[PDB]
């Protein structure tokens, strides 16, 4: 009939009727297609498809390793079919999941740091059962993770999805994530992007401290019930002031961002099973917080200003004003990180380096799932090696697909 | 079996045979995908085939204009019809023309100008018959175009597809195009990208001055026979001699380029008739020159060396110089073209506009096809309007597709 748009700058919607007269024989540019997200249940997982799944899993977690365990393999294969039979759906004993984790992340797409794929921390909260609990778990995993500044990558499972009205998930975004809090005078503090869900904190009894960088609560959600609030204890939240190397105006600023980018919303799917909840976390990478979440002009928006401090001419466009201060915010990002001792790597660095990691991977393997669109750095694009690399984008398994937001489809 | 994937960087070609494993249910990220280029042919088009499209686009023309002409459509579509049962193919009339050329470049999806869709002068070369002809049509062109700086978007047709062994043809990937030497010492001088295509000029008697800014000659095939090489006469093609606002030592770099921008390879199709000989222009985008043919590796490569100068951390991969560099030779690009008096238009004016003019497009007919990794400029990504929109990539008529590089299927 036609295909919605969206303009995640304006926030304006399209409907696309034209591509009806199309010849044929592309939604590459969509944002969250239905195709990388995995919603909700009512009822578990048909034991014939279960058993496919299940069977592919084992087979590739035990040909895997160097010189085979043949005699476990088909041990495994039994033992996995009958659980399934018996109790309908099966556990994963501790080291397929390690497996399966890294995995899911080595099939991310999306992912520039899957160079990294095999070194990640897995916290196994399979046996949890209550919120209190998750935000334990959450705690445990973000101070491991912080680590002082050296960043470590982690992933913390929490129990799989059964019925499904036994889901567990986090409703954040992400672990450590600013409020975004609408104000009197019209004007918006804090980070835009979390509005919405700033508010949601405020309806579950969370009080709003007002400010540009207050920490949103976690708000989890275990076996069925309820979303509880919990506050991030503040003594784990690591964060970075923003100060230029040679303007001392930037520190005037008064901005910073948490050191800790670990996506909380995300469904890590793995032979059948689907985890509902997995918060996963990396390093960040400058160009996010400087381009993204600083130069957005649906996040903190400060290029504008940055750009009068530095001089440049704000009001002609072709000055390439705009180019020259974002580069500046963005080496401010990267020295305060440098110089506070918090790990982050430069898009640059980073790019070198999914390069390396997609031609181990094809070596390897002869493939590697990469979205362009997300590979790419906001800045610098072709100055970057993956601009020039085409690049196969497909789902694969195990995957880390995305999820209809929780507060849409739950019945309190 | 297995999808080829080049890396137009270091030209390093791979084979992926993993996406085989995918679940199902994307070669956005392929540069000449086969559903974008319309190859060579040895039969007409069978009318049956023919019939149907031309129908459609008399329909297309007719329904075009404010208070419709009825009486003419019925009769066009008539005359037409007749014509193609009595000829086999067909001729559209000037107004048709014009309307196609405007039509298939309003359809193209990687073009950032669209908004200049309706402002195109259109040269009728459809009487044409021999090289030299095509030589002078082409000259009249690029002196229309070019206009001493203030540069007009235009574009020649040449006779349309007949049969297939009767196509008129430009070898050249554009118009003006700079030489690629390959060195006896082994450096390559001038324009790498060219290299190949240079060696054909030279084996065609095409004498090279073995220089980093020598205009390739022009190399056209006209009806069916072999290409004629023809030298572009050096009072017709305008350049510009880059130096920078403040650094005294840019000028000091011997860098330039041409100022227009002329596609001199694609084939238009419309209503069911294929012109492989339409060259178009329209005027450069900074980025294009600064960003893509200056600072590719694989064709100028000036960002070391620009680097130095600048007295930057060129072995320092962190210290964001890639960033800082690339800017100035993009200011350099900007500042010479408007100082030398030559139109061109920076990336976010022109990305500006983009957003402009597909709204424009979805107010005035729904729809408006956007290949995104064609459409962010790049450098200064998300710093742009169009890296935020969300668009959808499709072919629809008529269009400016691509063509197998004459070369190849070609017998003399
Ligand atoms: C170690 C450093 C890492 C870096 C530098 C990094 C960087 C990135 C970047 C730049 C993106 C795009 C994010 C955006 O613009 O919204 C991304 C996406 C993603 N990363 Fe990585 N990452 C790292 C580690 C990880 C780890 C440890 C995992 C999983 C265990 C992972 C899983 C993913 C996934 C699934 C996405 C997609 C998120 C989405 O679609 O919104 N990453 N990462
Ligand atoms: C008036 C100013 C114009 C500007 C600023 C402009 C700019 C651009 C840019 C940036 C691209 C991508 C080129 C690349 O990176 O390789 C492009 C592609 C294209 N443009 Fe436009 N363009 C303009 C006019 C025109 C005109 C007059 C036509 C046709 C009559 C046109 C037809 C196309 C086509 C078909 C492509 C695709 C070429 C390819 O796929 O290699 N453009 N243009
Ligand atoms: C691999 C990738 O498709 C390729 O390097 C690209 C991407 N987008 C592009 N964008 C434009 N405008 N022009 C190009 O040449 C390319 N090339
Ligand atoms: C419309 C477009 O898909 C969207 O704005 C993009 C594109 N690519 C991206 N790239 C990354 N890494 N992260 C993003 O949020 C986006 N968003
Ligand atoms: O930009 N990042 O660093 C980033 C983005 C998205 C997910 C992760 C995990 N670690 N770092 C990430
Ligand atoms: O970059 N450009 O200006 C550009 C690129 C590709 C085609 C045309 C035609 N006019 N300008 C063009």
Redesign the interface.
């Known amino acids: 009939q036609?295909?919605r748009?969206?303009?995640?700058?304006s926030g304006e919607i399209?409907?696309?009727?034209?591509?009806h007269?199309?010849?044929?024989?592309?939604?590459?540019?969509?944002?969250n297609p239905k195709?990388l997200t995995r919603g909700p249940r009512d009822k578990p997982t048909p034991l014939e498809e279960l058993l496919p799944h299940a069977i592919e899993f084992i087979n590739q977690y035990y040909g895997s390793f160097k010189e085979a365990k043949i005699e476990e393999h088909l041990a495994r294969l039994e033992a996995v079919t009958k659980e399934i039979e018996t109790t309908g759906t099966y556990q994963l004993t501790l080291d397929e999941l390690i497996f399966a984790t890294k995995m899911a992340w080595r099939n991310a797409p999306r992912c520039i740091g899957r160079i990294q794929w095999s070194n990640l921390q897995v916290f196994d909260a399979r046996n949890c059962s209550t919120a209190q609990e998750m935000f334990q778990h959450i705690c445990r995993h973000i101070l491991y993770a912080t680590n002082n500044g050296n960043i470590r990558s982690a992933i913390t499972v929490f129990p799989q999805r059964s019925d499904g009205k036994h889901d567990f998930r986090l409703w954040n975004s992400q672990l450590i994530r600013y409020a975004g809090y609408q104000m009197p005078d019209g004007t918006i503090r804090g980070d835009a992007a979390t509005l919405e869900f700033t508010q949601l904190c405020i309806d579950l009894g969370w009080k709003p401290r007002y400010g540009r960088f207050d920490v949103l609560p976690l708000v989890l959600q275990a076996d069925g019930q309820d979303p509880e609030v919990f506050e991030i204890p503040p003594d784990l939240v690591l964060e970075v002031t923003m100060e230029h190397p040679k303007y001392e105006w930037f520190q005037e600023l008064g901005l910073k961002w948490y050191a800790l980018p670990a996506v909380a919303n995300m469904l890590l799917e793995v032979g059948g099973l689907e985890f509902p909840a997995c918060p996963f976390n990396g390093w960040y990478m400058g160009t996010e917080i400087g381009?993204?979440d600083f130069?957005?002009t649906?996040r903190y928006n400060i290029?504008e200003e940055v750009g009068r401090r530095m001089g440049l001419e704000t009001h002609t466009?072709?000055?390439?004003w705009?180019?020259?201060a974002?580069?500046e915010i963005?080496?401010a990002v990267?020295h305060s990180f440098?110089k506070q001792n918090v790990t982050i790597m430069?898009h640059?660095?980073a790019s070198?380096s999914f390069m390396k990691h997609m031609?181990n991977e094809?070596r390897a393997?002869?493939?590697?799932?990469?979205?362009?669109?997300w590979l790419?750095?906001?800045?610098?694009?072709?100055?970057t090696?993956v601009?020039?690399?085409?690049?196969?984008?497909?789902?694969?398994?195990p995957?880390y697909y995305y999820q209809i937001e929780p507060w849409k489809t739950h019945i309190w």
């Open positions: 036609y295909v748009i969206k303009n995640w700058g399209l409907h696309d009727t034209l591509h007269k199309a010849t044929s024989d592309c939604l590459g540019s969509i944002m195709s381009v993204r130069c957005d649906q290029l466009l072709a000055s390439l705009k180019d020259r974002v580069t963005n080496v990267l440098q430069d640059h660095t070198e031609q094809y393997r002869g493939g590697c799932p990469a979205d362009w669109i790419v750095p906001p800045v610098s694009g072709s100055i090696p601009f020039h690399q085409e690049m196969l984008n497909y789902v694969l398994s995957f």
